[PDB]
Amino acid sequence: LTSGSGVTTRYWDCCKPSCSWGGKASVTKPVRTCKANGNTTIDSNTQSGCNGGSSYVCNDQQPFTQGNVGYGFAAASISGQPESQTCCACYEMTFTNTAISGQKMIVQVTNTGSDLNGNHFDLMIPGGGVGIFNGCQSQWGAPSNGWGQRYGGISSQSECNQLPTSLRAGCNWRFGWFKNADNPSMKFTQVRCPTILTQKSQCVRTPG
Numbered sequence: 001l002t003s004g005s006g007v008t009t010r011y012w013d014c015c016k017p018s019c020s021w022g023g024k025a026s027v028t029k030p031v032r033t034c035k036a037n038g039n040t041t042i043d044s045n046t047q048s049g050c051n052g053g054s055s056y057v058c059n060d061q062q063p064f065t066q067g068n069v070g071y072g073f074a075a076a077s078i079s080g081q082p083e084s085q086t087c088c089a090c091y092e093m094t095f096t097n098t099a100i101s102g103q104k105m106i107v108q109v110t111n112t113g114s115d116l117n118g119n120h121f122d123l124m125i126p127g128g129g130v131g132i133f134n135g136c137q138s139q140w141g142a143p144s145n146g147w148g149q150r151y152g153g154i155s156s157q158s159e160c161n162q163l164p165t166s167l168r169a170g171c172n173w174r175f176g177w178f179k180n181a182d183n184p185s186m187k188f189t190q191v192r193c194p195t196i197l198t199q200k201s202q203c204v205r206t207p208g
Contacts, residue, residue: 001189001190002078002079002081002085002089002091002189002190003187003188003189003190004079004119004187004188005096005119005185005186005187005188006078006093006118006119006120006121006185006186006187006188007118007119007120007121007183007185007186008074008093008120008121008122008123008183008184008185008186009113009120009121009122009123009128009131009183010122010123010125010128010129010152010153010174010183011075011122011123011124011125011128011129011130011131011153012057012124012125012126012127012128012129012130012136012146012153012167012170013050013130013131013132013133013134013135013136013146014049014050014056014057014130014134014135014136014138014139014140014142015048015049015050015056015057015133015134015135016033016046016047016048016049016050016053016055016056016057016135017031017033017057017061017073017075017110017111018083018087018110018111018112019031019083019087019088019109019110019111019112019203020032020033020044020055020110021044021045022044022045024083024084024087025083025084025085025086025087025088025205026084026205026206026207027087027088027203027204027205027206028202028203028204028206029044029202029203029204030044030203031061031087031088031110031201031202031203032044032058032060032200032201032202032203033046033048033055033056033057033058034055034056034057034058034059034060035054035055035056036049036054036056036138036139037166038056038057038058038059038060038139038164038166038167039058039059039060039166042054042055042056043055048135049135049138049139050133050134050135056135056139057124058200059166059167060200060201061073061110061124061200061201062124062125062126062167062169062170062173063105063123063124063125063170063173063174063178064169064170064173065173065177066196068103068104069104069105069106070103070104070105070106070177070178071105071106071107071194071196071197072105072106072107072108072123072124072125073107073108073109073110073111073124073197073201074091074107074108074109074110074111074121074122074123074124075109075110075111075112075113075121075122075124076091076109076111076112076113076119076120076121076122077112077113077114077115077116077118077119077120078119078120079118079119083112086109086112087109087110087112087203087205088108088109088110088193088198088201088203088204088205089108089109089190089193089205090106090107090108090109090190090191090192090193090194090197091106091107091109091121091188091189091190091191092104092105092106092188092189092191093105093106093107093121093186093187093188093189094186094187094188095181095184095185095186096184096185096186096187097184097185098179098181098182098183098184098185099179099181100177100178100179100181100184101184103177105123105186106191106194106197107121107123107197108193108197108198108201108203109121110124110201110203111124114132119188121186121188124170125153125170125171125173125174125178126163126167126168126170126171126174127147127148127153127154127159127160127163127167127170127171127174128152128153128154128174129146129148129149129150129151129152129153130142130145130146130150130153131150131151134146134150140163140164140167142163147159147162147163148162152182154171156175157171157172157175157176157180160172160175193205
């Protein structure tokens with residue numbers, strides 16, 4: 001199992017995540033994707049809105065809390081590891097350096113980010129910036145650059161009102177439990193995916 005130190009980012013480009021295709025890892029089902037509305041299930045082979053299709057990330061895949069523990073979904077780039085090893089794997093991380101230092105978040109990986117060297121987790125947070133891609137204009141009518149900055153997104157919890165209502169929980173999570181931490185570093189360890197995440201994503205690594 002994988003563990004180490006890493007860096008994080010925040011992002012929400014609305015796109016169908018890479019682990020939502022079949023054949024990317026040994027799993028029960030690929031990660032669930034949705035229609036434009038963010039709630040009704042679309043077929044896992046439907047093309048992504050980011051590539052001219054009609055499939056998006058589900059409202060269900062926003063960050064949340066259980067007790068004091070954070071939970072969410074993320075893109076990851078884990079030190080030269082293929083998607084067969086990362087897709088729908090879960091990692092629990094202890095934040096190491098911001099106002100959220102010491103806090104614990106458990107994410108399920110649903111996407112592969114950019115191949116930077118090392119361990120990189122891009123937390124999926126509504127309003128945290130679209131990044132390289134943006135299917136949020138076609139899904140929600142967001143601005144061409146996303147909500148706020150293309151990188152980092154909005155600056156204030158007041159601007160969470162600019163987001164679709166369906167994402168406002170996740171948006172707010174960034175300023176409450178997450179404390180609008182800016183790229184918190186962490187240490188992480190792979191864990192068996194909790195049902196509170198896998199009952200949302202529907203993607204369970206099945207060889208065990």
